[PDB]
Amino acid sequence: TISGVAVVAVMTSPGLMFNFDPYLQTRARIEQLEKVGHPTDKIELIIMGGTFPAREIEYQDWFIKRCLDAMNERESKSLEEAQKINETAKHRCVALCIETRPDYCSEKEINQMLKLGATRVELGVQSIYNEILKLCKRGHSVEDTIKATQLLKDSGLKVSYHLMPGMPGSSIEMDKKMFKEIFTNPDFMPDMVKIYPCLVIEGTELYEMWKRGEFKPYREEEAIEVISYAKSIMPKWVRTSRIQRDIPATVIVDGVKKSNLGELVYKYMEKKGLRCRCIRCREVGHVYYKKGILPDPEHIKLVREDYEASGGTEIFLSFEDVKNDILIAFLRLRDPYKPFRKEIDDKTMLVRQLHVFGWEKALTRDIKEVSWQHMGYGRMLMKEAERIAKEEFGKKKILVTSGIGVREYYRKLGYKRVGAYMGKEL
């Protein structure tokens, strides 16, 4: 399926073909997507490596600047100028995701990520059990994950967890309990999870453990059982990544090698009667592609679900066909717990995300182009968020975490730049 948002994933320096040049990587991906008719007016930029927040600030600012230069199609004098230019460019950076180790997620680093324009942070959690983390000689603790998650949430950012079932020392039941805990213990409650079973790749510590007879990775059966469980209990407010990996099968010494693990999980869940209600399974574009149906307007409602997370309250607002369970748009509103950013006080509510599922060329059906943007759903969710913030929680200002290329949208709704955010006085 072709999405309206182009994902541009780039690699930082210690990809290979361009010597890790940020501009060349970004440009090459955009041109490659244009070659196949994919829209590139909206770009999600993903910074891969996991060590980016530990690099020199000089390097971080330059790297992001040059990615934006490629989107803007012109040179700039500074990061700030490239960001300003990009607000009205032909290729707008609507989201910026930074991958990082949980222990590289201090207040100082979060300040830097906000300066860069980040909207999402993916934590290399892997496991929530310190026994497993220490056994595999990982460089972080679950305490690091818990603290990073709270600091990110209280700064308005989206939080994703990379999780690895089947690590040394774990078990099917241990993995299942981990997923239950991540969605029902307020220390965690991520917005998004990226799941793939632990693999044995030559040259890693996991390879050494495997060589010694300390590690037998999951085969397909076990991975399917764990991931199927995880999806069956995922809350409606959790977004999941397409189950896959960019690692070719010839480098996998041991572990799951087949390329359709996601499809195998789907068929397993069908066989067992396991339903999935998370964002990816219910979003309008995915439902049309998988099941050939569209939202029934007689049954579209504004729905609300609250949960406790990182000491505060998350409000998940959505427009949904509640007869067919099809998700059209959603907004993540947070009453923060212990913020540190200068622009967030105890009378502030945070809009951490607004997403209206938009254009999408489903090549395999007959209704070619389908979209729910420009129909009012985004504006209606914002109005409801403002009402809740003011009337129910007594807040006086609301701050939106906005992609660089989305600021203009919030300006139309009366918001103005407040530090790193778009803000409105209630």
UniProtKB/Swiss-Prot annotation:
It catalyses: uridine(34) in tRNA + acetyl-CoA + S-adenosyl-L-methionine + H2O = 5-(carboxymethyl)uridine(34) in tRNA + 5'-deoxyadenosine + L-methionine + CoA + 2 H(+). The keyword Iron applies. GO terms for molecular function: 4 iron, 4 sulfur cluster binding; metal ion binding; S-adenosyl-L-methionine binding; tRNA binding; tRNA uridine(34) acetyltransferase activity. Its EC number is 2.3.1.311. It comes from Methanocaldococcus infernus (strain DSM 11812 / JCM 15783 / ME). This is tRNA uridine(34) acetyltransferase. Its cofactor is [4Fe-4S] cluster. Keywords: 4Fe-4S, Acyltransferase, Disulfide bond, Iron, Iron-sulfur, Metal-binding, RNA-binding, S-adenosyl-L-methionine, Transferase, tRNA processing, tRNA-binding. One of its GO terms (cellular component) is cytoplasm. Pathway: tRNA modification. Residues 1-236 form the Radical SAM core domain. Belongs to the ELP3 family. It holds the Pfam family Acetyltransf_1. Changing residue 42 to A: Strongly reduced tRNA acetyl-coA hydrolase activity. InterPro entries: Acyl_CoA_acyltransferase, Aldolase_TIM, ELP3, ELP3-like, ELP3-like_N, Elp3/MiaA/NifB-like_rSAM, GNAT_dom, Radical_SAM_C. NCBIfam families: ELP3 (TIGR01211). Changing residue 158 to A: Strongly reduced tRNA acetyl-coA hydrolase activity. Disulfide bonds join 276-281. GO terms for biological process: tRNA acetylation; tRNA wobble base 5-methoxycarbonylmethyl-2-thiouridinylation; tRNA wobble uridine modification. Residues 1-222 are annotated as: Radical S-adenosyl-L-methionine (rSAM). Binds 1 [4Fe-4S] cluster. The cluster is coordinated with 3 cysteines and an exchangeable S-adenosyl-L-methionine. PANTHER family: HISTONE ACETYLTRANSFERASE-RELATED, TRNA URIDINE(34) ACETYLTRANSFERASE.
